[PDB]
Amino acid sequence: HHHHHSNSQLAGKRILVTQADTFMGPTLCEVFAEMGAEVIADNNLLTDPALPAKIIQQAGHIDVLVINLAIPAPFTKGELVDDSEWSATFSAVVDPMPRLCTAVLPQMIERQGGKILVMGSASALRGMKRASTYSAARGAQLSYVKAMGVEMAPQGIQINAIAQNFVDNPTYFPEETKANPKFQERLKRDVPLGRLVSLREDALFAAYLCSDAADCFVGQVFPVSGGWAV
Amino acid sequence: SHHHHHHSSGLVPRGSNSQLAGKRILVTQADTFMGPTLCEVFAEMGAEVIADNNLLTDPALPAKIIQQAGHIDVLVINLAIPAPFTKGELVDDSEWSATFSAVVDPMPRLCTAVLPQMIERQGGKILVMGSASALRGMKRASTYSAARGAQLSYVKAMGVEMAPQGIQINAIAQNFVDNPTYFPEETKANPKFQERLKRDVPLGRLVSLREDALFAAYLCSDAADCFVGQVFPVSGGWAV
Amino acid sequence: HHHSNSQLAGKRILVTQADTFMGPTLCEVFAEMGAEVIADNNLLTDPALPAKIIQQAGHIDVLVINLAIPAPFTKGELVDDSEWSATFSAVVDPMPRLCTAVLPQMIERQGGKILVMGSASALRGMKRASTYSAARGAQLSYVKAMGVEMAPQGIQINAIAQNFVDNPTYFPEETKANPKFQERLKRDVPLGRLVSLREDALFAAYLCSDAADCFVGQVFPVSGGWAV
Amino acid sequence: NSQLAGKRILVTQADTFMGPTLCEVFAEMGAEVIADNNLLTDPALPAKIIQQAGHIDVLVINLAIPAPFTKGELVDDSEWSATFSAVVDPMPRLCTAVLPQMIERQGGKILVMGSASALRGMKRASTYSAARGAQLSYVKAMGVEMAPQGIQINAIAQNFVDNPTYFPEETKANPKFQERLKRDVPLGRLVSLREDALFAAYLCSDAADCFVGQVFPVSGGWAV
């Protein structure tokens, strides 16, 4: 009858989040701020080769760089893919990554500390139909992280990736899809978890990897896909 | 009067609240391998820790330990004996039986004992404290590696099976964690060990007990309900 | 019914449970490629039996550890000690007994191969296969460790991790011919068909060949893309 | 023997990386080898090479430049562009050119000669690793997609093969190289060019029709 009516994990870290208005940008910016980060949100698509170095320059001190990069994944049949689709996908998802890392690494190497987290795709880990261009781009991200993480670990710098799929992302899982019983049957068959990973669950895992507790993780890819890929 | 105060006075540990508040967590072999650190870190995050110190070679014992605990939110399957260093061509039944009896056979007894209450309420977690020796081959570890592989494969199968019942079954696969049993002070004080460690382990240092336990604490939290049937290597990049 | 090729030339290959799982096809294909095949038919629950079999066979160039019982499909929460013990006794415990019996001659010669016929159930989780998967995982982790350990002695220890192989035990003709099974298979297995017994055995034969001396402590999924 | 009897196999950059060994061994196994020696940075060139060949049973995508050794924090756009232009971009140009004839007859194979640097992190190889990762993830996706049309697309992911580009006699003779190699490579020696090529030949055979979208590490246990 009484029952009717009756965080600082990232405190003081300056965290830059790229394409902060799309893919996992909104969830990361919201949850990182709840956990005490100073969030630097940038909304630019990074097709412009000059823009990453300007965004990093202008942000000043960066403790954590979150490389959140995306365009809507092409559905093109693998035998029909053209140079325009390949360049649009790699220009947006792949080419900006080293540009962001080479801009931010000097300050992290100077202070022997810093983190870079890539918000990547489990499409790079497990093959699926009609996603060949996006999968290839996403594989370039994961292999870059595995190599850079081994390389920068001795400098006190942690470079890791999430490899996500079946996250509650409105770009791919709009409410009318989620409400469809054929969708729910497919999801339960394909995803052991039996539901989408929440935006909050994804960002809280990201927040753990951006925390002092995760200093032991270097060059590691973490699948987040409800068991679709582990 | 203790010597750690000369240089380690006034230092706040890595990751220093209520992440496991109101969770009853049973830790097996709580006095060995990762047990002590897990019990300390879980209590620090607000868990009610049920610490069992028994070696579980007795087939009857797992069911009795689960039975006496009543409600268990999280079962942490921490099973270990000193890893045999035996050359592969010299392994015998006594070594194989000793290792599997301690590390492998208790695992399903514990899970079959605790799963009924978890199935009935559609909630619960089982975390296996496993070994990256099961992921990546090393010399003179064949028996221990095989036993640790049984754990990880059990987890991947059971986690898929129990996910639809609202239960998360996962594993850590650790190596190069600072367990003084395997990395004694006399080893750490040897420059060739430090030089070899930086060669073989991308992190360039041992993973701290605390770092490993903080990751286990995350996996035991509500935030980690999205993880089912997943193995998480914790080895400073030695295995990823 | 109702009432009733020199790829392996000059190699002695012992195949365990030669009448069972991949045994028959391995024996056929290895013989086709010039191997002298030692076909042993014993279930190896008896601890003394692997040393006897290896002793009696004499010179072994390749040991193929083919171990199987019908996989339990017991719900994970209902598994008992009898199931666990029967599965590990058959599929796991014999493996080191066979390897410790055969390795001395291979170490002496600085040459030899051990190939485990394992399961992709150890790589990818599936429902209602907990005991069998755990046992198969012991096999694959044993191979990875032993392969690293014995490589410097000039010995190659590897595994196949199969699933969705055209084994009539698990995939009867009548099931294969069912259109609902054909739909599920095309959904779950990229290959869109079962791997033939011969395809599996031919890959086993490649791993047992001199060309495969570069492979040590490696697991090779053979499941038509279900696990890679 | 005749493991590849009556197969037309097109090998790209047939003069570079694994090209020469693949051409020798495939012909040894009874293939009709179509050797093309071009660097494929020109976007127009893959379609022309496939068009001129007529029937292709197997396409071997052997793409390489010497791997940059640049420190990760010092990589610039020209290194990134040069590596992806040579190693990545030509890959789908080649596949989109050959796949129509394969889809039409419901048969054919595409094998990518890739790198285990995409699987396991190594220092001073960030650009090359990223490029090689694009190849392996392309293969996994394309292999699933094309398997139902009766086409097999797979990759080798190699390292520690006896390739004189990376392991010249001077390096191999250094006992400090021989010490490191035995530390880092379970096999305890380099994989031979012939071993690598015979494995590739197996994957181009009818017996390997069961393999779709699969990556095969070939690195003496360095990556498995």
UniProtKB/TrEMBL annotation, chain D:
Keyword vocabulary terms for this entry: Oxidoreductase
Example GO molecular function: oxidoreductase activity
PANTHER family xref list: DEHYDROGENASES, SHORT CHAIN, ESTRADIOL 17-BETA-DEHYDROGENASE 8-RELATED
Biological source species: gamma proteobacterium HTCC2207
Family: Belongs to the short-chain dehydrogenases/reductases (SDR) family.
One Pfam family in the UniProt entry: adh_short_C2
InterPro entries: NAD(P)-bd_dom_sf, SDR_fam
Protein known as: Short-chain dehydrogenase/reductase SDR
